[PDB]
PDB file of C-alpha atoms and ligand atoms in Angstrom:
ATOM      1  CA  UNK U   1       5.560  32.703   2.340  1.00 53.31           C
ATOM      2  CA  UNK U   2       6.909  33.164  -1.336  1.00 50.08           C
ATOM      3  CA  UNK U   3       5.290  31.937  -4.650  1.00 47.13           C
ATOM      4  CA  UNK U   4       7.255  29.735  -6.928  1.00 46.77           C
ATOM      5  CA  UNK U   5       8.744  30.887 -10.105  1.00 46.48           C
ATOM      6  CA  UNK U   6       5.676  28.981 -12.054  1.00 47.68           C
ATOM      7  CA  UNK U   7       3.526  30.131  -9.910  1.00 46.96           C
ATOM      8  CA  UNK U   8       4.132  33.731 -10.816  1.00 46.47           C
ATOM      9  CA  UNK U   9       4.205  33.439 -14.740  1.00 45.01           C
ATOM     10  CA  UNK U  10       0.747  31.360 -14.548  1.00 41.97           C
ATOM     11  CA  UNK U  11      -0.682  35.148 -13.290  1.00 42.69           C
ATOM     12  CA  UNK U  12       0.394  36.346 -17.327  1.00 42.35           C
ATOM     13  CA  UNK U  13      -1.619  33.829 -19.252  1.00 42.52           C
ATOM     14  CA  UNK U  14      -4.833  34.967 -17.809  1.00 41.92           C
ATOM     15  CA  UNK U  15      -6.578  37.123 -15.129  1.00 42.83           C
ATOM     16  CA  UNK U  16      -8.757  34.007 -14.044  1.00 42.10           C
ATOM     17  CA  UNK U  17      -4.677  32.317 -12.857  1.00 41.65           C
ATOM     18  CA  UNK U  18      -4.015  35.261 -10.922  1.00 41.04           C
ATOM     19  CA  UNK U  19      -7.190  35.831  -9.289  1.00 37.56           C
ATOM     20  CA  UNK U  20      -7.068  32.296  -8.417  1.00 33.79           C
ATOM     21  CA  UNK U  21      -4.107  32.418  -6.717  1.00 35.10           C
ATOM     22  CA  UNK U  22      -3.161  33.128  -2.698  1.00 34.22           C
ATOM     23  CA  UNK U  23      -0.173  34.547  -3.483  1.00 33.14           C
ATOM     24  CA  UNK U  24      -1.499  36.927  -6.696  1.00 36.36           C
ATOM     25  CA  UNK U  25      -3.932  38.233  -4.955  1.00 35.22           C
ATOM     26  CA  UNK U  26      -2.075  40.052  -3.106  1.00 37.20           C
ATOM     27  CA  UNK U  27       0.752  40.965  -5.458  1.00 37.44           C
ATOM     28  CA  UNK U  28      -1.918  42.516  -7.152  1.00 36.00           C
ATOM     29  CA  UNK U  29      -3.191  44.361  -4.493  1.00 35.58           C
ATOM     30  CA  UNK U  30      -0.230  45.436  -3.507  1.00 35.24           C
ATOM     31  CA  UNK U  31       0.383  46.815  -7.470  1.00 36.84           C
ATOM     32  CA  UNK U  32      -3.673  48.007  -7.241  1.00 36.67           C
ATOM     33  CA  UNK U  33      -2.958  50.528  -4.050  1.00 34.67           C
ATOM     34  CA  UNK U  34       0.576  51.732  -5.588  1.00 34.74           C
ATOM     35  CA  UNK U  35      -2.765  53.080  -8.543  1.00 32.84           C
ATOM     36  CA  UNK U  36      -5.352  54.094  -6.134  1.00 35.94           C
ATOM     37  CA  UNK U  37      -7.685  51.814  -6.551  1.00 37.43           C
ATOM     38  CA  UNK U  38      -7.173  48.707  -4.465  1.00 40.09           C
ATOM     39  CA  UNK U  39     -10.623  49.242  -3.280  1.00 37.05           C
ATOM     40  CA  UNK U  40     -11.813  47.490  -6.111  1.00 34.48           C
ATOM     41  CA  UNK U  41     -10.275  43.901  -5.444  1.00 31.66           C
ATOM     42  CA  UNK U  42     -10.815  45.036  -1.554  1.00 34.52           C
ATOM     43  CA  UNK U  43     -14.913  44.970  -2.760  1.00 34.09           C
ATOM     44  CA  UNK U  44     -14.648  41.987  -4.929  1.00 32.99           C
ATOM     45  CA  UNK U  45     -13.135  40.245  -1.955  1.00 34.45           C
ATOM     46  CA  UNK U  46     -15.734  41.506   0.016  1.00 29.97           C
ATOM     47  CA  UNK U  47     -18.267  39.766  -2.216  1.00 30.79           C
ATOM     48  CA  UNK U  48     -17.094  36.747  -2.259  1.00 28.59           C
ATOM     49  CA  UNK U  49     -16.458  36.211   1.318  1.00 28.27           C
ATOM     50  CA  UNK U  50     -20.490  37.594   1.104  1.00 27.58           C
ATOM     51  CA  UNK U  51     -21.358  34.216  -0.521  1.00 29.31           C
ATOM     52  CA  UNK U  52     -20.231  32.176   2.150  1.00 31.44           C
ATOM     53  CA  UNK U  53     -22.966  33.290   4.733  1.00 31.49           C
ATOM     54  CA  UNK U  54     -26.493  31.390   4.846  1.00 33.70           C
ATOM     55  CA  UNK U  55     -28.103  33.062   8.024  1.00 37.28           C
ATOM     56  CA  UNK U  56     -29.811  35.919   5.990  1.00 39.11           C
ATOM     57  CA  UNK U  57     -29.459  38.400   9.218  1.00 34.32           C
ATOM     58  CA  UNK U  58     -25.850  37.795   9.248  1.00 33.48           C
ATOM     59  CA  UNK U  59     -25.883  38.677   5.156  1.00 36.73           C
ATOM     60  CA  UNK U  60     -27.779  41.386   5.913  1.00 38.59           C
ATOM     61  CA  UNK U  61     -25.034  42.424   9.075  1.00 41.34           C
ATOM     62  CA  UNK U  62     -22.183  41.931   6.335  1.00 40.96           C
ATOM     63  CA  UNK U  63     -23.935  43.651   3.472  1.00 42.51           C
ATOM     64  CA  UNK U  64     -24.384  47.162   4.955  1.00 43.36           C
ATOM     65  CA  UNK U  65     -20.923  47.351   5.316  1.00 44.95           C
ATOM     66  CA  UNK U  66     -19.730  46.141   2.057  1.00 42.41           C
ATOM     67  CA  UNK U  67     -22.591  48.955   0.957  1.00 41.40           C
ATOM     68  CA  UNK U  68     -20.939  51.341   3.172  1.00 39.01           C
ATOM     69  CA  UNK U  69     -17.559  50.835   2.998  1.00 38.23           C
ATOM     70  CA  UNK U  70     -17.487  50.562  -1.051  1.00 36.63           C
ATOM     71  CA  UNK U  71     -20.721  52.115  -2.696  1.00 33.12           C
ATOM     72  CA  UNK U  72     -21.647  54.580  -0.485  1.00 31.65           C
ATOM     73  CA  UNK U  73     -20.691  58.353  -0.212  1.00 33.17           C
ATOM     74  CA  UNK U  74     -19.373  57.411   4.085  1.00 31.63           C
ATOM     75  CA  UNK U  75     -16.747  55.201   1.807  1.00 29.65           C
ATOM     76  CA  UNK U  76     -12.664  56.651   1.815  1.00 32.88           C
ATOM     77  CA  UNK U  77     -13.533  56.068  -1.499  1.00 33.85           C
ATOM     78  CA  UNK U  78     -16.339  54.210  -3.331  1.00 32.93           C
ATOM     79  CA  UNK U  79     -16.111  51.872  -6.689  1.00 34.44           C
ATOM     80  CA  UNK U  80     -16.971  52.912  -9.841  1.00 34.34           C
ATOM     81  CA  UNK U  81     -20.695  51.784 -10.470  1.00 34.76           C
ATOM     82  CA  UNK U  82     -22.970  53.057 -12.722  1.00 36.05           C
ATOM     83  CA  UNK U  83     -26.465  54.427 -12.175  1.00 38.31           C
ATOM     84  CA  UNK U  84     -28.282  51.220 -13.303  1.00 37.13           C
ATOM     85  CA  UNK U  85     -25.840  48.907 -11.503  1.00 39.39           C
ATOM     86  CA  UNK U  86     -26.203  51.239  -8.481  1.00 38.86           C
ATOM     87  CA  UNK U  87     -30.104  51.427  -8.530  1.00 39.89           C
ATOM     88  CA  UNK U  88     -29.937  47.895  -8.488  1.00 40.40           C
ATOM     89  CA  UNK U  89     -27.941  47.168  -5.507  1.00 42.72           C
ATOM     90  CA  UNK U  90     -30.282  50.051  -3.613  1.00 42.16           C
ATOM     91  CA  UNK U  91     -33.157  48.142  -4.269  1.00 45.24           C
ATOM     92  CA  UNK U  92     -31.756  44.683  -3.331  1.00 43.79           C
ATOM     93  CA  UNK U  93     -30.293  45.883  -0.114  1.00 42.64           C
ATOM     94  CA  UNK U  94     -33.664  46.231   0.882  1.00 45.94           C
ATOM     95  CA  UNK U  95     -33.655  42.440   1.773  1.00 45.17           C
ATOM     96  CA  UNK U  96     -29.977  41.872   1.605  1.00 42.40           C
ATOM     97  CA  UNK U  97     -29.437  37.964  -0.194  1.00 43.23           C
ATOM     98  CA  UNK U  98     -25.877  36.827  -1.100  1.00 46.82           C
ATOM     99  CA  UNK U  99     -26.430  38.071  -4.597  1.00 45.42           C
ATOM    100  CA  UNK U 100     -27.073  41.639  -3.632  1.00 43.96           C
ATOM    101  CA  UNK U 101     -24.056  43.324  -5.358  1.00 46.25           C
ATOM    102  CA  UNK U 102     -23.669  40.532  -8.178  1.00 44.14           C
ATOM    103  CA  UNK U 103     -24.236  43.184 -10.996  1.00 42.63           C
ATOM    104  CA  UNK U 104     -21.305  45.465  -9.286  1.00 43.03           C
ATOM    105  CA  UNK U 105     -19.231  42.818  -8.307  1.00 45.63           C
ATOM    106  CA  UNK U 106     -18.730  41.614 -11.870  1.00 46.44           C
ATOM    107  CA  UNK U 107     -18.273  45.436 -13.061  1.00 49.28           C
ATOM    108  CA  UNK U 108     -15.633  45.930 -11.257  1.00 51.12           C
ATOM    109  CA  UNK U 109     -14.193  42.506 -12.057  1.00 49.45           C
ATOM    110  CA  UNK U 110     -14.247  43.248 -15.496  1.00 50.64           C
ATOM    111  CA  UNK U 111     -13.035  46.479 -14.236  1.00 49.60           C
ATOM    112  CA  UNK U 112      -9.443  45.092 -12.926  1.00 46.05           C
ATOM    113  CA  UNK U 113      -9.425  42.603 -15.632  1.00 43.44           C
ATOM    114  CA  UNK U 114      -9.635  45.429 -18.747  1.00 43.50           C
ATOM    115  CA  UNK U 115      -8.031  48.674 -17.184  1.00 45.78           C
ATOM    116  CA  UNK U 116      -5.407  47.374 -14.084  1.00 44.65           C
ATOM    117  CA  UNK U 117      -4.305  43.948 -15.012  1.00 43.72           C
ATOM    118  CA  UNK U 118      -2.716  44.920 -18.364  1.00 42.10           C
ATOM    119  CA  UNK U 119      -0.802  47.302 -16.194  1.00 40.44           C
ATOM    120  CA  UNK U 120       0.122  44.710 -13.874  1.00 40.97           C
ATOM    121  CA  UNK U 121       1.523  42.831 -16.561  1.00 38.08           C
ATOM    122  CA  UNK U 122       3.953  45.629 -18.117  1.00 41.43           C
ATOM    123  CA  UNK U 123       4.701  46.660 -14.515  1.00 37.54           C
ATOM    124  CA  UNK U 124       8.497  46.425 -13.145  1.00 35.23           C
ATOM    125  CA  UNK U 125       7.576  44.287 -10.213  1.00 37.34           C
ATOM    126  CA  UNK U 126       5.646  41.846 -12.368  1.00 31.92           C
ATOM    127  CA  UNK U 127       8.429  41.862 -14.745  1.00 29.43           C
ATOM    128  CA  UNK U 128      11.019  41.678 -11.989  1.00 32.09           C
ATOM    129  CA  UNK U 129       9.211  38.529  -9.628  1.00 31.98           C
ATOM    130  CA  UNK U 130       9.245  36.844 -13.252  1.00 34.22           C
ATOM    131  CA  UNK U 131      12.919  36.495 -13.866  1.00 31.04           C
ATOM    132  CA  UNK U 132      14.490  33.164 -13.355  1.00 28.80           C
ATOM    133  CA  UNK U 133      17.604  32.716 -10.333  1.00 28.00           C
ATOM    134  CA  UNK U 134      21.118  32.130 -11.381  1.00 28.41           C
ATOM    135  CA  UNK U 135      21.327  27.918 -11.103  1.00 26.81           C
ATOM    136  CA  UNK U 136      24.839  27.642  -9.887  1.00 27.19           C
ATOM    137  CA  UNK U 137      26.673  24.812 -10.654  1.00 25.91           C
TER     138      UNK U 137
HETATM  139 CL1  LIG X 201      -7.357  37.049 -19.332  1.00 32.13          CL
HETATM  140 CL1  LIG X 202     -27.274  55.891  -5.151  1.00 33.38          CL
HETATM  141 CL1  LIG X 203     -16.905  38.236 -10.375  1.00 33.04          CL
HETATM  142 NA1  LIG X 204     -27.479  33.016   2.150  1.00 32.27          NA
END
């Protein structure tokens, strides 16, 4: 695949376009790992796909890992959370619901959307999938 010309720009009027998009997703992951720290959209991911599942064993299945593969010390390498955010999400995995990690997902959102994304924005390969092709004629 390969994301129209308009399609890339839309990702540089606002965060909400490109995490929106198929296609900038993964751009942006792809500029978030080049920085160490593509676990964060790798987590937020993980939350949303979270929200999908109704059979609350299944959440609960789905939810220790997301704990373990992000938050937790066993993680490569956790998110960024802090104390209160993480005390939270302890105490709601006791009964895991869909909304366990909502106070850490939208950390880190705002996370990617303060520090990264301006990055991604004055970043070569941003600036570089934004120029126009030659129209011949
Ligand atoms: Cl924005
Ligand atoms: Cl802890
Ligand atoms: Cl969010
Ligand atoms: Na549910």
């Amino acid at each position: 695949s390969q994301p129209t010309l308009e399609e890339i720009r839309s990702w540089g009027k606002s965060f909400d376009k490109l995490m929106k998009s198929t296609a900038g997703r993964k751009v942006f992951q792809n500029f978030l790992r080049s920085e160490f720290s593509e676990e964060n959209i790798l987590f937020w991911l993980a939350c949303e796909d979270l929200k999908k599942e109704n059979s609350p064993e299944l959440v609960e299945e789905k939810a220790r890992l997301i704990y373990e593969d992000y938050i937790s010390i066993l993680s490569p390498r956790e998110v960024s959370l802090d104390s209160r955010v993480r005390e939270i999400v302890n105490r709601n995995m006791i009964e895991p619901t869909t909304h366990t990690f909502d106070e850490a997902q939208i950390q880190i959102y705002t996370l990617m959307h303060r520090d990264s994304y301006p990055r991604f924005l004055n970043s070569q390969k941003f600036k570089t999938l934004s120029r126009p092709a030659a129209k011949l004629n």
